[PDB]
Design a protein around this ligand. Sequence first.
Ligand SMILES: [Mn+2]
Ligand SMILES: [Mn+2]
Length: 141
Amino acid sequence: KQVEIFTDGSALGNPGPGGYGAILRYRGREKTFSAGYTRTTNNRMELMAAIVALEALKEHAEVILSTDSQYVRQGITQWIHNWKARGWKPVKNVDLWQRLDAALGQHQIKWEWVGHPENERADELARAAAMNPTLEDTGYQ
Ligand SMILES: [Mn+2]
Ligand SMILES: [Mn+2]
């Protein structure tokens, strides 16, 4: 019952137009997730990509999440546990981190920090979305 998730973000500014791209692969078949925002950051899009994808799952499963985000990696391996222990204090992009934390709750997540062409596919989706934003990142306050 393993499921592969590949994510990436893109941003043409900080803040600026941005987008996320996620590839959800299971049993040779895969689903795609991407959307662009008018004003956001790559960091937020990186998180958003994981969130949308994990929340697409309607049942517990072994998930292998692959991403080249240095932000997500640091957050997950060095900050997350401390933020939760301190009562999420709030912390920058707390809205997304808490959202992701929840999603990663009902799942057996195995992280793969970046060889898969799928990561490039996510990159392409995120960049395309950043160039054609249709949403607003209400969380970027
Ligand atoms: Mn990236
Ligand atoms: Mn990229």
